[PDB]
Amino acid sequence: EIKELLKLGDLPTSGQIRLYDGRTGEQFERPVTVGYMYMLKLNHLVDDKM
Amino acid sequence: TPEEKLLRAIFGEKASDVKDSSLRVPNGVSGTVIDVQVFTRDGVEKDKRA
Amino acid sequence: NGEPIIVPSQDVVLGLYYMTRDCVNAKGEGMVLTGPKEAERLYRSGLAS
Amino acid sequence: ARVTVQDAVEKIGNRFDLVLVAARRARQMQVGGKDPLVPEENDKTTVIALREIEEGLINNQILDVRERQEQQEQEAAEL
Amino acid sequence: NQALGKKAISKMLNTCYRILGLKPTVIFADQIMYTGFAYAARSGASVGID
Amino acid sequence: KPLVGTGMERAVAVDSGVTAVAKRGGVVQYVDASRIVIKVNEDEMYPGEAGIDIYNLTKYTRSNQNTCINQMPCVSLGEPVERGDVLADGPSTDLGELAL
Amino acid sequence: AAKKMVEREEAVVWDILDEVIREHPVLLNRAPTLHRLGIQAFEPVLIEG
Amino acid sequence: VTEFLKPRLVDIEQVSSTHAKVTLEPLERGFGHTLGNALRRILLSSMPGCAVTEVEIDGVLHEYSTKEGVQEDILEILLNLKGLAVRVQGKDEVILTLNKSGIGPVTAADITHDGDVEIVKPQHVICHLTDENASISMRIKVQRGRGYVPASTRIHSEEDERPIGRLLVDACYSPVERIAYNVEAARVEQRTDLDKLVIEMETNGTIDPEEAIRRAATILAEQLEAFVDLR
Amino acid sequence: SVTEFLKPRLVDIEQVSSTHAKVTLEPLERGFGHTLGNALRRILLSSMPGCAVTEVEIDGVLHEYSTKEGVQEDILEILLNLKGLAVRVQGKDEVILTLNKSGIGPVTAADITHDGDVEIVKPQHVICHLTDENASISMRIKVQRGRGYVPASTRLLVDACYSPVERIAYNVEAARVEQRTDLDKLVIEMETNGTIDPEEAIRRAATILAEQLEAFVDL
């Protein structure tokens, strides 16, 4: 169903996109995963640590 | 201490009567003071800001 | 024990294991190079895998 | 300089006596009594001590000899 | 001229230590880190559900 | 909002305390960034009493862990509400879903 | 005066720190210090952050 | 041979108000990517824009407070002004001014229009006035520059600074948003393989696409002047 | 000060040999280490004016797989030796040479017929060791002005190391102006055939990347 949903939008089934390298400008061989992981921000803030 | 009586006499300064014990923002921290509150004990004359 | 403790650990061994491997039919299968230098140029220029 | 103290240990053996030799010589350079031998590459007195030690031009024997020489001159400041 | 897993790379460093001493082993440790990181990045060895 | 969630989060936000849920349905009448004022319906309204609900949102106030517990309105002026419905996002809520 | 100078963090204390830092090891440490290699002295690089 | 072929800016399509494509027809073999990446890099890094920088709403001391009649914290109004897409023709810092009263949204179309100041999205919303006799009045300060400048670095410099009324917004002076180039087979009539470059960009609305590509190339040539005729 | 990007100093060109060289710069704006270094290296390495030997027809056998008398250097090894013959040529476009030489020791770059235009940079180069007799060798060698580097497939044929560079590698690293803390510091590193040194290969590369942009730049 995840693949079916990814086909609903025109994204690719594998979920793996060809990313380029923003510095040298040349593709990373062997496609990489890209998605939106929902990321928390734990309050182990470093300026309560130093 | 000696050399301090010397310094004070040389530069005509009267030593302070009272000691600084202010509240100061802790090192490193910025901020915008969003609220102040003054708790005056019963029987002490409320200042301007109270 | 006399063995090293500055062993390359986890991304670096992935980087070496991915450099120093060999597909069976890439670009430049079986072309004679004049040294490491033009192996680096055949790679970066986009001529060999 | 300086990344390692390997060669300075190959010259002054035992690898702890290196520390003592370099620390004595760096105290000499730091407390205003003496002057580097090898050209300082903008080093603190510590790395200069170890650079001195690497060239074979300072160790514990040389330091004793120079100390006795300079303390005998102060005897020769008897007038 | 082999595959260079992890045993092989710790072996490489150990023999460089036992042949060339220390300074070449350290500078070679760094060059092996830098080139390992660079080509691992170039590979985009991403993981995915397929 | 959790872009990939599990549906337990609408309830983790409502059944907590942070979000400000309406008590009685009705239609919103005034939406400041520091209060909501619900014109309660004629049916849910009691027999004789002026039925309008007032919601004093809790603006920036220190929590225990020194963070900032806040409440913003998610409603709009003159929009229907219903009982058991959120009126104000709390700290880490987004239209009533727990956004951490 | 030097104290208040480094407290105001003028442009000369950062030069002076870059110079009294230069060839001076520091001793990093990690909490459970099992073996004797969990205290190794490094040479600092002054880094934002 | 001809010993090189130079690119010339040829088409500048306007697919929309925000984003638009440019094309650089005669590129040789390999220079497609060589310019494509460097220009993408320059464009995303260095392009002068005009983000608002300071705000001074009327009855407001600090940004953690809530004016009445307007259903946004002042914190959200600052984060709304931060996206204000504005151009100035002649000045560096201009002080726009936004008065408005009575129920309803407060777009950017309610700003006092000045001569050499244009707002690209008038539909951009600042805050929702929500009361009859409740108004807002605020002096916005759209200065102008390069890159990104947070307010912690902007706490600067000296005396005359500043009242306990002024808010600072984290300036984000950069009109480009997205870049995506494509070399492809350019068909010049007598030639085999010349590359075209299609630098499709995506602006907030305050850059002439031709002007962006020109300034990118200029910054690259200015930098590269040092490698040429080395010291 | 909106278009005033801080330009570097080229504060060092410390060079290891005549062909090796390690050029730095500092500082560049934060993010120009890569844009500069990468444009320069793709141009140095993929399109540079150069003349190098194209194809060969050895008098022994015209098949690359073959046998040749009195030589312990196979055909492919002779071709590897020929790719490194660093050759400077004047306006004469294509110049084919003769190397057939008699003796027993090393066949070198001194063994080439000394034509009017062609110029060799390492006469001490080696092309093939030979046996103990009069000789066994005769080859027609073809240098051809080209650009970049073009393998034998696209063309006995030989890969063409036209471009003088044999290596380029930039390594951006954190420079430091007094106040600003994050500024690049490119550290170029370049080796050439000897048909030109690094100190001028970088000049020629930047000149290419500037003339490529004459259609846009202002002032």
XYZ file of C-alpha atoms in Angstrom, chain I residues 17-180:
164
model
C 59.013 19.979 -7.580
C 58.908 21.472 -11.045
C 55.783 19.522 -11.935
C 54.157 19.225 -8.517
C 52.853 22.348 -6.831
C 50.561 23.178 -3.935
C 48.764 26.486 -4.382
C 46.607 27.821 -1.599
C 44.393 30.849 -1.171
C 42.663 32.598 1.652
C 40.219 33.693 2.447
C 37.274 33.180 0.156
C 33.653 33.860 1.032
C 32.014 31.116 3.028
C 31.192 28.630 0.317
C 33.534 29.598 -2.512
C 36.233 27.059 -1.793
C 34.220 24.460 -3.622
C 32.700 26.560 -6.397
C 36.134 27.882 -7.360
C 38.113 24.704 -6.830
C 35.605 22.572 -8.645
C 35.228 24.775 -11.697
C 39.000 25.022 -11.921
C 39.554 21.305 -11.619
C 36.867 20.238 -14.073
C 38.352 22.706 -16.539
C 41.963 21.706 -15.820
C 41.115 18.043 -16.133
C 38.473 17.816 -18.854
C 39.192 20.541 -21.392
C 42.710 21.960 -21.738
C 44.778 22.663 -24.822
C 47.353 19.923 -25.333
C 49.233 17.738 -27.789
C 49.846 14.087 -27.015
C 50.524 10.974 -29.032
C 47.377 9.625 -30.678
C 47.995 6.334 -32.483
C 50.908 4.127 -33.446
C 51.726 1.520 -36.065
C 54.616 -0.663 -34.913
C 56.518 -2.354 -37.709
C 56.298 -5.671 -35.877
C 52.559 -6.411 -35.955
C 49.548 -4.124 -36.386
C 47.518 -6.163 -33.884
C 47.801 -4.948 -30.289
C 48.150 -8.573 -29.196
C 51.411 -9.672 -30.795
C 55.066 -10.579 -30.428
C 58.087 -8.386 -31.122
C 61.674 -9.576 -31.323
C 64.449 -8.521 -28.980
C 62.194 -6.646 -26.555
C 60.887 -7.610 -23.134
C 58.253 -4.874 -23.507
C 54.992 -6.069 -25.015
C 52.952 -3.897 -27.332
C 50.569 -2.626 -24.657
C 53.517 -1.738 -22.443
C 55.089 0.207 -25.309
C 51.802 2.050 -25.673
C 51.739 2.903 -21.971
C 55.237 4.250 -22.396
C 54.078 6.315 -25.350
C 51.161 7.966 -23.552
C 53.583 9.775 -21.275
C 55.710 11.328 -24.028
C 55.117 14.933 -23.003
C 55.269 16.850 -26.291
C 55.046 20.576 -27.062
C 54.157 21.389 -30.663
C 53.960 24.712 -32.455
C 51.190 25.690 -34.873
C 51.981 22.615 -36.970
C 48.751 20.748 -36.278
C 49.623 17.054 -36.745
C 53.215 15.839 -36.819
C 54.047 12.144 -37.189
C 57.536 11.036 -36.194
C 59.910 8.105 -36.593
C 61.688 6.392 -33.713
C 63.299 3.291 -35.257
C 66.623 3.040 -33.475
C 69.575 0.687 -33.339
C 71.391 -0.661 -30.328
C 70.839 -2.815 -27.272
C 70.145 -0.586 -24.264
C 67.167 1.633 -23.451
C 65.189 3.337 -26.195
C 64.514 6.821 -24.873
C 63.139 10.189 -25.928
C 66.548 11.137 -27.337
C 65.961 8.454 -29.981
C 63.276 10.420 -31.817
C 63.901 12.062 -35.146
C 64.277 15.743 -34.274
C 61.686 17.415 -36.466
C 61.437 21.157 -36.922
C 58.412 21.956 -34.774
C 58.072 19.122 -32.268
C 59.681 19.581 -28.879
C 60.164 16.973 -26.165
C 60.303 17.828 -22.480
C 61.836 14.661 -20.970
C 64.429 13.309 -23.387
C 65.340 10.949 -20.547
C 61.976 9.192 -20.921
C 62.023 5.502 -21.798
C 60.024 3.918 -24.596
C 61.277 0.341 -24.897
C 64.230 -1.794 -23.834
C 65.711 -3.849 -26.631
C 67.999 -6.853 -27.157
C 71.723 -7.348 -27.889
C 72.141 -6.988 -31.645
C 72.012 -4.291 -34.328
C 68.399 -3.471 -33.383
C 64.774 -4.520 -33.650
C 62.433 -1.525 -33.769
C 60.599 0.731 -36.213
C 57.545 2.791 -35.318
C 55.602 5.717 -36.739
C 54.328 7.830 -33.846
C 51.529 10.372 -34.264
C 51.098 13.365 -31.951
C 47.935 15.350 -32.586
C 46.803 18.568 -30.917
C 43.607 17.852 -29.030
C 41.637 18.873 -25.984
C 41.020 17.084 -22.732
C 41.429 13.339 -22.839
C 39.973 10.869 -25.278
C 40.287 7.098 -24.773
C 41.069 4.623 -27.511
C 37.481 3.454 -27.927
C 36.344 6.868 -29.175
C 39.274 6.858 -31.585
C 47.176 0.461 -33.148
C 45.424 3.250 -31.269
C 46.533 4.959 -28.077
C 44.788 6.947 -25.408
C 45.528 10.643 -25.716
C 46.662 12.422 -22.566
C 46.264 15.823 -24.176
C 45.828 18.000 -21.092
C 49.074 18.771 -19.235
C 47.564 18.059 -15.823
C 48.091 14.657 -14.250
C 46.468 15.540 -10.937
C 44.332 18.179 -9.259
C 42.804 18.135 -5.846
C 41.373 20.982 -3.818
C 40.783 20.752 -0.080
C 38.740 23.598 1.339
C 39.403 24.247 5.003
C 38.381 26.838 7.528
C 40.290 30.068 7.066
C 39.856 32.946 9.472
C 39.576 36.665 8.985
C 39.764 38.412 12.357
C 36.070 38.686 13.206
C 34.352 36.387 10.706
